[PDB]
Design a protein around this motif. Structure first.
Motif, PDB file in Angstrom:
ATOM      1  N   UNK A  28       0.823  -1.210   0.000  1.00 49.15           N
ATOM      2  CA  UNK A  28       0.000   0.000   0.000  1.00 49.15           C
ATOM      3  C   UNK A  28       0.856   1.257   0.000  1.00 49.15           C
ATOM      4  N   UNK A  29       1.915   1.285   0.813  1.00 46.68           N
ATOM      5  CA  UNK A  29       2.784   2.457   0.841  1.00 46.68           C
ATOM      6  C   UNK A  29       3.438   2.687  -0.516  1.00 46.68           C
ATOM      7  N   UNK A  30       3.928   1.615  -1.140  1.00 45.64           N
ATOM      8  CA  UNK A  30       4.527   1.678  -2.464  1.00 45.64           C
ATOM      9  C   UNK A  30       3.538   2.095  -3.553  1.00 45.64           C
ATOM     10  N   UNK A  31       2.242   2.167  -3.252  1.00 45.19           N
ATOM     11  CA  UNK A  31       1.249   2.474  -4.264  1.00 45.19           C
ATOM     12  C   UNK A  31       0.863   1.313  -5.157  1.00 45.19           C
ATOM     13  N   UNK A  75     -16.453 -19.525  -3.702  1.00 42.55           N
ATOM     14  CA  UNK A  75     -16.372 -19.884  -5.118  1.00 42.55           C
ATOM     15  C   UNK A  75     -15.356 -18.999  -5.843  1.00 42.55           C
ATOM     16  N   UNK A  76     -14.139 -18.972  -5.299  1.00 45.49           N
ATOM     17  CA  UNK A  76     -13.041 -18.243  -5.923  1.00 45.49           C
ATOM     18  C   UNK A  76     -12.563 -18.967  -7.174  1.00 45.49           C
ATOM     19  N   UNK A  77     -12.312 -18.187  -8.227  1.00 47.96           N
ATOM     20  CA  UNK A  77     -11.895 -18.726  -9.511  1.00 47.96           C
ATOM     21  C   UNK A  77     -10.395 -18.624  -9.774  1.00 47.96           C
ATOM     22  N   UNK A  78      -9.671 -17.760  -9.051  1.00 54.27           N
ATOM     23  CA  UNK A  78      -8.295 -17.370  -9.360  1.00 54.27           C
ATOM     24  C   UNK A  78      -7.701 -16.639  -8.164  1.00 54.27           C
ATOM     25  N   UNK A  79      -6.394 -16.817  -7.938  1.00 55.94           N
ATOM     26  CA  UNK A  79      -5.681 -16.113  -6.870  1.00 55.94           C
ATOM     27  C   UNK A  79      -4.666 -15.147  -7.481  1.00 55.94           C
ATOM     28  N   UNK A  80      -4.614 -13.919  -6.949  1.00 58.19           N
ATOM     29  CA  UNK A  80      -3.607 -12.929  -7.336  1.00 58.19           C
ATOM     30  C   UNK A  80      -2.687 -12.688  -6.150  1.00 58.19           C
ATOM     31  N   UNK A  81      -1.470 -13.221  -6.226  1.00 58.24           N
ATOM     32  CA  UNK A  81      -0.458 -12.961  -5.209  1.00 58.24           C
ATOM     33  C   UNK A  81       0.233 -11.631  -5.509  1.00 58.24           C
ATOM     34  N   UNK A  82       0.132 -10.678  -4.590  1.00 55.04           N
ATOM     35  CA  UNK A  82       0.870  -9.423  -4.675  1.00 55.04           C
ATOM     36  C   UNK A  82       1.935  -9.442  -3.586  1.00 55.04           C
ATOM     37  N   UNK A  83       3.183  -9.664  -3.979  1.00 50.21           N
ATOM     38  CA  UNK A  83       4.279  -9.591  -3.035  1.00 50.21           C
ATOM     39  C   UNK A  83       5.474 -10.391  -3.491  1.00 50.21           C
ATOM     40  N   UNK A  84       6.127 -11.079  -2.551  1.00 51.49           N
ATOM     41  CA  UNK A  84       7.288 -11.887  -2.865  1.00 51.49           C
ATOM     42  C   UNK A  84       7.124 -13.364  -2.567  1.00 51.49           C
ATOM     43  N   UNK A  85       8.244 -14.051  -2.330  1.00 52.75           N
ATOM     44  CA  UNK A  85       8.253 -15.512  -2.288  1.00 52.75           C
ATOM     45  C   UNK A  85       7.257 -16.083  -1.277  1.00 52.75           C
TER      46      UNK A  85
END
Ligand SMILES: [Co+2]
Ligand SMILES: [Co+2]
Lengths: 385, 385
Positions: A48-51, A93-103
Motif C-alpha cells: 500500500x505504501x509503495x502504491x 467460489x473463488x476462480x483465481x488467486x492474485x499474489x501481490x508480493x514476494x516468495x
C-alpha cells in the motif's frame, strides 16, 4: 552430451505503466466469471505504501473483477494461513488467486491454489503422500525480486505446529502469469539490493562451474548473463531509479531463474550450503554471505578444472590469470558496498567447525565439482575469515 | 525500455538414446487411455529409411499405445488432408496426435488438433472467422531442423482448391512436447545443412539490427548465440556426425526460435522479403539466398546506426572495422561452401526491378531499420550481383 528436458508455462509480462495487464490477464486465465482472492503480506502496509495496492484495485475495477482480500502472510508462509485460504476459496467460489508480493505470498498462493481444487488435505502434497494434479490457478505481481518463485514449480510452506518445513514441486504450481516491473527495484534499500545482485550472479556461477562437458552454447549464454550483472550492478547501485539499469538486472534474474540457458549441466551447491550455516548462526544476508564464501570456494577448487576457471575469468573479466580474475571478482563485490571478510561482520572462527558439521550432516563430503570433507570446509571458512 | 510479454508452454526433450520419451510423454499429455494418430510425410519413406519409424512404433508398443497412421503430408500441407484427419479423429476417438517429421507434418498435425475438438469448419480459424479455443494436443518428433514450428503457435495450411495459403496463430497451437535429437542432423545433405546454419544466424541477425534501445542483456544473449553458430557451423560442416557440434547448432536454433533472448526488440524483415522474391523466381535455397542478401543489406544500411554495427562486429567477429567485419562474415559463408554472388547461381540483373516491385507490393518502402524504396532494393540486389 547430457540429455535434458525443459518446460516453463508461466507467462511473463515485463515492463511498466501496464497495470491494466493485471485484470486483462485474470480474465484470460480465470475459469468463466472472475472472482479472485487478493493475497498479500501482513495487512498490506508495504504494498500500500509503495502504491501497488491502489494500482491493483484499479485494474480489478476497470475489468469488473470481484475480489476478496486475504492478508496475513508471514516471511516463512504458514499452513495455518493456507488452510484458511482453502476455506475462503471453496465457500466463496473463488476462480483465481492474485499474489501481490514476494516468495512468501507467492508460495502461500500456490498452496491455496492446490487445496482449493482438492477434496483432501493439502499437506499430502508437501509430505509425499499425494501428487497434486490440478490447481485453481494464480497470477503474481512481483514486488521484490528474489529466488524466482513467480515462475518456479515449487512451494515452500512451514507447519508451525510440528515446526516442519516442506516443499511441493510439480508442474501445476507454475503461476499462470507473472507481472515484472523493474520499477519495484527503486525502493529496495542499498544493502539488500547489493545482496540481490550477488544472488543473481551466485545462481549463475553455481551452474557454471561444472564437470559436465559439451556445454559451449550454454557457457556462452551464462557468461553473457553474468557479464551483464557485473557491468550493470555497480551502475544500478549508484543510480537506483535508472529504468534501463533495473531492467537489465531484473531480466538477468529472470534469465537465471529460467534455466533454458543452463540446460544440460550439473550445479554445485557447496557455497550455498556453507553460507546457509553462517546465516543460520549469524544475522547475515544471503547475498552478503555468498560474496564472502564464493571467492573462497573458487580459490579452494581452482585445481579441479582450471580450464573452466580460465574460461570464466577470460569471458567475464577479460583475464586468463585466475588470481587476478579472483581479485577482480572481489573488487566487483566491494564496488556494491560489500565487505569481503567474515571478521568484518564480527564473525570469528569460533563456530567454523560446528558450521562445517551442520553443512555436512550425515555425509562425509559435500559438493559435486569438488567433494569437500569437514576440514576442507574449515579451510574454505579460513580463506574467507 | 520496450515492454514485452513472453510465453512458451512446449516441453523440450533434448538429446539422444531416449526414444522411450515418446510414449512416456504421450501418456503425460493424452486425456485418459492414449489412442493416437501417427502423422507423417508421404508414406514414411524418409523416416522409415532413417530408422525413426521403427523407433516410434517400438515406443508406442512399450507403453501399450493404440495408434492409427495417417500419411500423405505434402511440403505445403493441404487442407484436403487436414479435413481427412479431423474425420479419423472424431470417428476413431483419437486422444492425441504425434507428428513425425518437419514443418509440413507439424502444421498439418496442428490444424488436425484444432478441428478434432471443434464442431464447425477448421478453416474459420485460418480465415479470421473464428478464434480457436482448444486443441486435442500434439507432440512432435522433429526430423529436420527448420523454422521451429515444433515450438511455435503458428500453423500454415494451403487450400489448393482456391489456391489460398492461410495462417492460424494462437496459444493452443503450441505442441505439448517436442523431441529434439541432434542425430537427425547427421543425414542432411551438405548444401541443405549449410543453408540451415545460415537460417539460424539470419534469424538472430534480423532481430539484432534494431533501432530499439536499452537491450544490453538481449544484445549479449543474441551475440553469444550468433558467435556459437559462427564458431561451430564450420566445424559441423567438416565433421557431420559429431554429436557435440550438432548439439550446439541445434540448441542455437532452439534458442533463436524461442525468443526469450530476443524479448523487447523490433525485427527487420527486409532481407527475408528480398530473398523471398529471388526464391520465387529462381530455384534458390532460402539459406543460400540469405547468405547472399544479408551482407548486401548490411552494406546498404551501414549508416543508419553504425554503433550497433560496430558492436555486432566487435562482439561476434572481434573487430570494430565494419568493412573488415563484413568481409569476415562473407568468409564465414564461403567456409560453409556457399558462393556469395547471384551471378554464381546464374541469376542475372534481368528481374531485379520486378523482384523489387513484388517485394514492395502496394507500399512505397519496405523495412524498419531502414525504409527501402524500389531503387534501394535494386541497389541492394546490385551489391549482391
Ligand atoms: Co544460492
Ligand atoms: Co528469414
Amino acid at each position: 552430451m547430457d540429455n535434458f528436458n525443459y518446460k516453463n508455462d508461466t507467462k511473463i509480462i515485463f515492463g511498466k505503466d501496464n497495470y491494466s495487464e493485471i485484470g486483462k490477464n485474470i480474465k484470460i486465465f480465470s475459469k468463466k466469471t472472475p472472482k479472485i482472492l487478493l493475497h498479500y503480506e501482513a495487512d498490506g502496509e508495504l504494498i500500500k505504501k509503495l502504491g501497488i495496492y491502489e494500482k491493483v484495485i484499479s485494474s480489478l475495477k476497470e475489468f469488473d473483477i470481484e475480489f476478496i482480500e486475504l492478508g496475513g502472510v508471514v516471511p516463512n508462509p504458514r499452513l495455518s494461513l493456507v488452510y484458511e485460504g482453502i476455506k475462503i476459496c471453496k465457500e466463496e467460489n473463488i476462480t483465481f488467486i492474485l499474489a501481490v508480493g514476494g516468495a512468501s505470498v507467492i508460495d502461500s498462493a500456490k498452496a491455496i491454489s492446490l487445496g482449493a481444487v482438492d477434496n483432501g488435505d493439502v499437506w499430502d502434497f508437501f509430505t509425499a503422500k499425494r501428487i497434486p494434479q490440478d490447481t485453481l490457478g494464480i497470477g503474481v505481481v512481483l514486488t521484490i525480486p528474489g529466488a524466482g518463485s513467480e515462475m518456479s514449480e515449487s512451494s515452500i510452506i512451514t507447519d508451525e505446529n510440528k515446526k516442519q518445513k516442506a516443499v511441493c514441486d510439480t508442474e501445476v504450481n507454475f503461476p499462470k502469469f507473472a507481472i515484472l516491473n523493474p520499477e519495484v527495484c527503486y525502493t529496495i534499500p542499498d544493502r539488500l539490493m547489493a545482496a540481490g545482485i550477488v544472488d543473481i550472479l551466485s545462481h549463475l556461477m553455481e551452474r557454471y562451474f561444472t564437470k559436465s562437458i559439451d556445454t559451449a552454447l550454454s557457457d556462452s549464454l551464462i557468461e553473457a548473463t553474468m557479464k551483464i550483472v557485473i557491468k550493470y550492478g555497480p551502475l544500478l547501485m549508484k543510480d537506483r531509479k535508472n529504468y534501463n539499469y533495473c531492467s537489465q538486472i531484473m531480466w538477468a534474474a529472470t534469465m537465471a531463474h529460467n534455466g533454458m540457458i543452463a540446460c544440460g549441466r550439473v550445479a554445485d551447491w557447496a557455497s550455498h550450503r556453507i553460507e546457509h550455516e553462517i546465516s543460520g548462526i549469524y544475522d547475515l544476508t544471503h547475498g552478503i554471505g555468498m560474496a564472502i564464501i564464493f571467492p573462497a570456494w573458487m580459490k579452494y577448487t581452482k585445481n579441479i578444472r582450471p580450464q573452466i576457471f580460465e574460461k570464466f575469468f577470460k569471458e567475464v573479466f577479460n583475464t586468463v590469470n585466475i588470481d587476478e580474475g579472483i581479485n577482480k571478482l572481489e573488487e566487483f563485490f566491494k564496488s556494491l558496498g560489500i565487505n569481503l571478510k567474515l571478521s568484518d561482520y564480527g564473525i570469528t572462527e569460533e563456530y567454523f567447525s560446528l558450521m562445517a558439521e551442520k553443512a555436512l550432516g550425515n555425509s562425509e563430503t559435500l559438493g559435486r565439482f569438488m567433494q569437500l570433507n569437514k576440514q576442507d570446509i574449515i579451510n574454505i571458512l579460513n580463506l574467507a575469515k
